[PDB]
Design a protein around this ligand. Structure first.
Ligand SMILES: CN(C)c1cccc2c(S(=O)(=O)NCCCCCCCCCCC(=O)O)cccc12
Length: 130
């Protein structure tokens, strides 16, 4: 259901989320316009996500329910797991550096992929079109 090539269309509250994550103003302004594109293929409970943005092009592979390591654009390391909760992908991560929870949720809403982040009580959404 998540399959295909998704290109970011708009954000909600993403600058405040980046600020909470400790990102400086220049990098927030870059991050607001990162041209994030996700190419997602699901095979059984296994996903491959090609992440392309102005910061980096990387390939992510994960299996539902299996812990993996993932590094953010500035090298900040996360560990966590994606699971399917109803029709939503729920990504439960923790920052290695401070142990704090970072959650990502992926959902289809109509013809859009809604990617929601939470960190320390601050929400952001990045909404993609296919
Ligand atoms: C270039 N630099 C310094 C950066 C610019 C803008 C935002 C940045 C964030 S951030 O936390 O504010 N935004 C990124 C959030 C990404 C959360 C990813 C969730 C886990 C994905 C797992 C793999 C997948 O399923 O695709 C973290 C670290 C560096 C950032």
């Amino acid at each position: 259901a998540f399959d295909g090539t998704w290109k970011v269309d708009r954000n909600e509250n993403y600058e405040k989320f980046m600020e909470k994550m400790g990102i400086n103003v220049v990098k927030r302004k870059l991050g607001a316009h990162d041209n994030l594109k996700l190419t997602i293929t699901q095979e059984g409970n296994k996903f491959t996500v090609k992440e392309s943005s102005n910061f980096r092009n990387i390939d992510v592979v994960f299996e539902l329910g299996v812990d993996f390591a993932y590094s953010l654009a500035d090298g900040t390391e996360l560990t966590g797991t994606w699971t399917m909760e109803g029709n939503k992908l729920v990504g439960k991560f923790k920052r290695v550096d401070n142990g704090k929870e970072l959650i990502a949720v992926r959902e289809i809403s109509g013809n859009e992929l809604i990617q929601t982040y939470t960190y320390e009580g601050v929400e952001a959404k990045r909404i993609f079109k296919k």
